[PDB]
Amino acid sequence: SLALSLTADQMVSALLDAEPPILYSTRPFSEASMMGLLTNLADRELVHMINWAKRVPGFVDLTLHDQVHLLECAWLEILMIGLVWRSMEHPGKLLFAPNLLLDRNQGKCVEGMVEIFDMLLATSSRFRMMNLQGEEFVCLKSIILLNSGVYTFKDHIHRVLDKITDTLIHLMAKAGLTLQQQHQRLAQLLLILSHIRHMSNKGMEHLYSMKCKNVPLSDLLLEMLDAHR
């Protein structure tokens, strides 16, 4: 697999290059307005995410069925970590898009949403206090894509993951961090993926409720949702 032959800096470049763009979306209150906007945004983002995933080294080497599985398992985590990343410079704000910043006071008007808003805001601040770097971020994203569904079903994925770990370390080293600071930062970053997974699961549930409680959902969105059933 080509991924395994890439150098740390080649790996970082490929990820930066595969990066999707920031898409654009009336202060949303009420389930309809907010969810209409959130789903529409996610719909378009999913098409970019998919073609992004295809440009993550090693991913393309998997069978189509395996690619499908990983995407189905990680899609919401990948959307959320992107949202959290975009919101770093906006404390107490969720930057769904350059023209759509929400705070918790808007999640308040949507049953069982504020709790998840708070979780996302907390992760965002955490990313911030850590001075999380863009190159670090892309590495975390690829890790989520490859890891989240690896046990939901192998060697190949595990090595590529090891490869990505080498890349994170390489980056912190390039940034002048000591050995101790390197393995400490590495652990901190990865501990947040657990929270990312948590927010995805709670979000997935909230969406199932939204689905059955019938805003309209795209067929793609409906399929990604049913994958988690």
């Binding site: 098409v47 073609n51 295809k54 499908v68 995407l71 067929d219 793609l220 399929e223």
Partner: peptide, 10 residues
């Protein structure tokens, strides 16, 4: 079948 099958396929 599924839409994801197609989009990834491309």
């Amino acid at each position: 079948h599924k839409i994801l099958h197609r989009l990834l396929q491309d």
